[PDB]
Design a protein around this nucleic acid. Structure first.
Length: 57
RNA sequence: CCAAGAAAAGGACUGGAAGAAAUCAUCCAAGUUGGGGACUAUUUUCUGCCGUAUAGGCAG
């Protein structure tokens, strides 16, 4: 069977708040032309936060 | 049969100028290292002639 993933609006928007409030390890991903990708990406100025948990090597 | 499949970040460049770290000084006093002792054994090197000769040369 072929699978196509898609990003959840509700889930990503919550993560942007939790990492800054709970002080989690994170970084930022840039998007050119934020208005062409979506409501949230535009509101965030083209910078979106993600979790960063590398292995202890 | 992998958030699957493909991919050239490149080209150029003058950090410079100038300067005083200085004056002073008490480490001292005492002191028990000692007592005992096998380098030779199953070793290998003897016996002679010439030569003034413990020199130098020789047979067995």
């Amino acid at each position: 069977c072929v699978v196509t993933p898609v990003v959840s609006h509700a889930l990503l928007a919550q993560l942007q708040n939790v990492v800054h409030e709970k002080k989690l390890q994170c970084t930022y991903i840039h998007h050119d032309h934020p208005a062409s990708v979506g409501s949230l990406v535009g509101a965030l100025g083209g910078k979106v936060a993600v979790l960063d948990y590398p292995p202890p090597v």
